[model samples]
Target: STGSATTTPIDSLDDAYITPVQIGTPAQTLNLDFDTGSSDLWVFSSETTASEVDGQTIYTPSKSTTAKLLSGATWSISYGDGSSSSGDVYTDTVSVGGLTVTGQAVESAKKVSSSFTEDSTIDGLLGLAFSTLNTVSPTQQKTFFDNAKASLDSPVFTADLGYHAPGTYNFGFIDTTAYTGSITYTAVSTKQGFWEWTSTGYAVGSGTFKSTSIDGIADTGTTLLYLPATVVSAYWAQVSGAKSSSSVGGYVFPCSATLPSFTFGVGSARIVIPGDYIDFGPISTGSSSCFGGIQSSAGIGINIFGDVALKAAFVVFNGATTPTLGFASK
Candidate 1:
């Protein structure tokens, strides 16, 4: 689509992943993960305290003439990685392709560690979830969506997350003129931070984890797809030569081999997780290796569909309509 202008709806899911807009006018481009479980936008800033930002994308205030630092406000965020970052607030005009919103509050992380710093591709997170679940108070910080909702001609957003190839997730005033298919909507419950739902028994590869009844929230805010140990171990058994690798503290497999397609039966809704999403990163010090679709939850008590599950569907976390996470094919 054109920059700062209306774009068309992506008919296919694979057309989703694209470079997202960074905060501040004369906006800088930062590749971001489209998160649906939370509502907030954050980026690393040039003023980050230490040289710890060796491999991260730093948002330098000097880079943008319109950057506004919120003097006394402090910012902190805890990731599913069990890692966290804390800093101050800053506002700037941010845009995604043709969608532009000014004065969006962003967190400038000053205290970040190596674990969260090594990935430069993960420059920031775009929270497309809900306004109520925003980690930052609306009184303290209004999300890019809360501010931009007024200007959007459609007043709606659709994220066509990727599957086979890289996907293109489009936002701002959806052009209903494009796809004629029906948009299936799901109801959201706000009791939990996640978009809650009941799934059919959690299936792992060929085996079934008894008592696999899922009754938790599905989070797009998370990057890792987490499941119970029983579920993960059972899934590892399905993939040929799949084994637990201590190197990365997760399951790994030989990259050259093919494994059975992993599918999560969410009641009547089944989402197929591509093998590539299962095994994208390096295994410890070794090259690419075997990886399962799900991972042990490190005792963290939540079943979240992070980037792994999100990439598989055209997910709509609607806070405007009904409080629910809607899933459909692009």
Candidate 2:
């Protein structure tokens, strides 16, 4: 069941990436955010409260012959960004890019937070992390990737994203043409159910490379790249007008501030991130200050290499018994 698919950037900030997946016997298509940070295949459905529902398309179990409610099963998820949703569980046919799992757990949301309801572009989330992270109370369900792994040619998946451009998600195999040069791979620790890996170090602009261990998760669910305060401060220090801004969150700089390319080491290889991608966008409409995609992870405890970093490289989430993450420039 190896499959390949493309992605779409939803908003101006290129804040999130979403792809289509079909659920039920008749195959009701829903655009779901493929988040590697968590493992729960949940969706907005008929079970959602009318007041809590916005313009999102909903999945109705009653309409699908293959949909079966899992009695006494319940699930709730709260993300790092304060967004949350809770609901019951059901088993249904689920397919992503032609790869199908006959009895995949399809969590239907009964309640959702304001942020989720506010963003009409995303119908729900399809978690691609380890199945151990599942939240179903009675019997934690297996993630789509876990359930479909056996049918795949190899236990692997890759993410290729670009700055405000179309991206591709390949399952079971890595597409050689998607990346440049040789891939730099590192051992991945799944102790915490994330695609966790450590970078050798980083460099600001053309400065000397700093040697340090920077551990982080390659999370497609998150929008910004978060690193230790020391590293983040060092990066912003190079931008003349950059300063920490509590009002809009994270650090911001003059919209036109000169930015330097950032480089991070992976194993023996280094990937460079162009300056334009680091300048995410302005704080608000016509604002003179712009937010940096690279921010501080001090508050979150662990550093996060999210979309901002992944967008600059071709990343592989190898799911072999001993997982390893690979990174290479696009």
Candidate 3:
């Protein structure tokens, strides 16, 4: 009645988390990024240019007897970091953990941006966002979760992303043991095809909690937390040798600097992000500077509670009549 899959953080770069998934009749396994920010199940495939394939595993439709092409249909996606992929469509049997969905739309990439090509460990992306955000043209595509929801015990999935550790992504049911304390629920305003919610306020270090509301999306695909420019400025101002760098494109500080803890409000619950977690590794190899995991959401118009923030808590993405987010300490 319920299904779950475990995901492990990539060893070299702890930037993105990946989980194993199977496709087609014979079941070609691939490591995919379960992205909550986008809605399209795309893969590097035989159709992808040889040069673009790099070290990624390619999904070969010709090898799968169950694969069916949706003639003339295609899908394309570009990420906020300018990474992109676009391709033709195929209907195949897709499986995550023990859950199986037939005739799932699997986009096979014909082209990929340099940003994606360089990161060869990521075979493709499995989108968990709402189906309305799917990029397939003419006839829109449905995500594996949406297609399998009818059969699931409950229309819900929980994202248990861990920091530099393995985590689980459970489908159809919520695992109470995965989180501790109480699961605080918040009403999610689903406009613009994202799981958007408003934070009551936030505080820098142990300072007073300012009643400044911030509307943001809980984006699992993104690597860092993005807040309002003014708020980010305030947090970094407390850290010595921290500055907004045009070259780095965000706030950076000396690697040895002692950073303060950051806390955000969700209803009456306060989720405090540790000081060390805010330091997103060094800016470059052998560099004495590090990039702050919390950045400015200036041009984005909306803030983003990316993996840096989400990993600290257990998250439930509910697809009920009134969709809501359930968060608790992990």
Candidate 4:
């Protein structure tokens, strides 16, 4: 179904599932998140060997009736959470909503854990991230966008993000005019498959985050926004009632009150991050309540504005045209 893919690309040498993405027809789309870090696209098969994983959905090859397995030895994929599984490649006439492409590639996970077993409705993944980070052969060139562009209606793809609700991302045809014309594309750094942008600085509520204009990157791999220590702490300090508590993951506060919205200005563009993100899923603990949003990953040089901050925004990573990224309000 229709769901949002992560805004950040995953960081991995091997192919793996990173974020859930939307594929299929507009009428009845399927929600799937794959690893943007790697480029392998696979689903569950009828002949799976491993146990089901938690929060994972298995795709039945037999359901398509046009599935074809690749002629290669079985392979397994692992992640940072100490999770791993083996699978094989397959080709079949896959159909996503009204867009059906024949001979599309897919993978079948024979073995899985309970996490992967849940959500039976999830089909599989479609790898359309970075080139060097794709599952397509490094020798022979092939990509979902390349093929889908040829077969799609307008040869355009669009990405839509949500905080934690698993929003929707679209591929094939991009209504280029759907976004504000103020969008800008910044060149990406060499050796970094991840798309990043340098921000001029940040503003939280009424206070300025830092004097040194901040420049950060955007990522879909991560779940929440990661700010620089100085910037994050500085913003928290500006909050009228902000407090530091170690029990609830350090820099956090009560969620009941409506906190100020934070904005990160990059060049002439600015993205607003609501306070609810910091108060995400906060629960009360008798005297003090827990707050989400800002975490204590201080000293990390890199700052990431996660999918939570990208919602209601139209973002495009123009890897083919140039090393740049485009953004606009939906």
The lDDT leader among the candidates is 2
> Whose lDDT is higher: candidate 1's or candidate 3's?
3
lDDT tens string, model 4, 112-149?
55545654544445555554544333232244554555
lDDT of each: 0.61, 0.91, 0.89, 0.53
Q: Is candidate 3 or candidate 4 better by lDDT?
A: 3
Whole-structure CA lDDT of model 4? 0.53
To one decimal, what is the Cα RMSD in angstroms of model 2 from the true structure?
0.9
**In model 4, which range of ten residues has the least summed lDDT?**
8-17
> lDDT per residue, candidate 3, 1-330, as tens digits?
578999888753458888999999899998999988889999999999999978998899999999999999998888887788899999999999989999999999999999888888899999988889999998998988889887999989899987778899999998989988888888898788888888888999999998878999888899889999889999999999999999998999999998998888888888888787788868888999999989999997779999888888889998887788888886
Provide the lowest-lDDT 10-residue window in model 1.
Answer: 6-15
The best-first sequence of candidates by TM-score reads 2, 3, 1, 4
For model 3, how big is the CA root-mean-square deviation?
1.1
Model 4 error, position 139 (Å): 8.1
Q: Write out the backbone clash pairs for model 3.
A: none
Look at candidate 4 and tell me the lDDT of residue 84.
Answer: 49
How well does candidate 2 score on lDDT at residue 53? 82
